Design a protein around this ligand. Structure first.
Ligand SMILES: [Mg+2]
Ligand SMILES: [Mg+2]
Ligand SMILES: [Mg+2]
Length: 89
RNA sequence: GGAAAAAUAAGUAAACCCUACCAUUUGGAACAACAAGAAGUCGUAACAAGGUAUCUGUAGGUGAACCUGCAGAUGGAUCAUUA
């Protein structure tokens, strides 16, 4: 019964020292399209919604604002502070 | 007959109040705003034709620098080619 929402925040190296923040685990409820926008202006970086495996929708922005995002999804509510994961090396 | 107090009207007009307006100073705050700086963060606009150019005006859009349409100017990557 994995109904709960488990959000994964990834941090990838896409070039020398340039990083990527990845957010996967956002319920389809609210379309990312509108979170793509806000996050772009929020952190000031380019976003992209990547969709691997037909159903799973992922937000892939450049940087490393995981600290921000978790603080964002929680403060907002779209994701309870507990269920949010920070896979950070 | 002179003549003190008192009282009188018009007058000069102190102060005071109300109604407008001027001048000179001085005041004010969270959030906001502005100023300056950097190997903060994201990208790369501009110089190099700096990915096939900048730039002016106006218009519209955009995380950001900016892109794009129409019209110009070279301060351009031409001072030049009917045989
Ligand atoms: Mg700077
Ligand atoms: Mg223009
Ligand atoms: Mg404009």
């Amino acid at each position: 019964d994995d109904f709960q929402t488990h959000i994964h925040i990834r941090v990838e190296q896409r070039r020398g020292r340039k990083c990527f923040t990845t957010v996967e685990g956002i319920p389809p409820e609210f379309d990312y399209e509108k979170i793509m926008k806000y996050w772009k202006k929020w952190l000031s970086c380019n976003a992209t919604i990547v969709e691997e495996d037909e159903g799973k929708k992922v937000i892939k922005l450049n940087g490393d604002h995981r600290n921000q995002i978790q603080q964002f999804l929680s403060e907002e509510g779209i994701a309870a502070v507990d269920n949010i994961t920070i896979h950070g090396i």
